[PDB]
């Protein structure tokens, strides 16, 4: 699996609901080895998300500096584990939002490889 393809599996849902995160965290394999605690899905075209790597260069939350913030806010869905969630029985709360996405980009072609934050 390439880094770019892993970002698409974990974070892109361009074609698309309070069960959404429970359905999607399982279908994208994010409950397989552990309950991935927080994960965001983006409901914008893949072209529009890839274009963020040409938008505003900002620091990543860990201090790396190859992150990029979208000039427009985007339709996103935050998936966050519930208080009862415990692996192997993962459970998620779904929250829809409209926020600027921040991604780390790598490669040539230069594309998103990590979803960092929304602001």
């Amino acid at each position, epitope marked *: 699996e390439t880094a770019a393809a892993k970002f698409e599996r974990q974070h892109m849902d361009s074609s698309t609901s309070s069960n959404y995160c429970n359905q999607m965290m399982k279908s994208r394999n994010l409950t397989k080895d552990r309950c991935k605690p927080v994960n965001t899905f983006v409901h914008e075209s893949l072209a529009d998300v890839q274009a963020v790597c040409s938008q505003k260069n900002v620091a990543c939350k860990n201090g790396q500096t*190859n992150c990029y913030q979208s000039y427009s806010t985007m339709s996103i869905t935050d998936c966050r584990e519930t208080g009862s969630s415990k692996y192997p029985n993962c459970a998620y709360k779904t929250t829809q939002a409209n926020k600027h996405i921040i991604v780390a980009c790598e490669g040539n072609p230069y594309v998103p490889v990590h979803f960092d934050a929304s602001v």
Partner: nanobody, 123 residues
């Protein structure tokens, strides 16, 4: 100026022991690139990071082979990065590339690249 362009100048042919400066100025990007740097690809070798510096003039990193001979600076213009190269050695012969928007000397993290400027150090 719809396209980002990393304009490279300086470099070229020089005798061993001599000096050159490489200059890079980005145009077409409205904000500040946090990291800029210089990479090179020498004959027979993979591309490597040579020097990089953050927009505050800090986070400065050099390839071990050039520490104490090359000096990177960003104090000469917004999104500009310069490399003073002293005491040049034949093994510094390479295509040098300006890069912007990445992290430290990690090539895969940079998304904007100059076209490449030849530096040739003769004996």
């Amino acid at each position: 100026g719809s396209q980002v362009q990393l304009v490279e100048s300086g470099g070229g042919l020089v005798q061993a022991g001599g000096s050159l400066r490489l200059s890079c100025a980005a145009s077409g990007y409205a904000y500040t690139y946090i990291y800029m740097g210089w990479f090179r690809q020498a004959p027979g070798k993979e591309r490597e990071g040579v020097a990089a510096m953050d927009s505050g003039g800090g986070g400065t990193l050099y390839a071990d082979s050039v520490k104490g001979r090359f000096t990177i600076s960003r104090d000469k213009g917004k999104n500009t990065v310069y490399l003073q190269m002293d005491s040049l050695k034949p093994e510094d012969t390479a295509t040098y590339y300006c890069a912007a928007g990445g992290y430290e000397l990690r090539d895969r993290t940079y998304g904007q690249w100059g076209q490449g400027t030849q530096v040739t150090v003769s004996s």
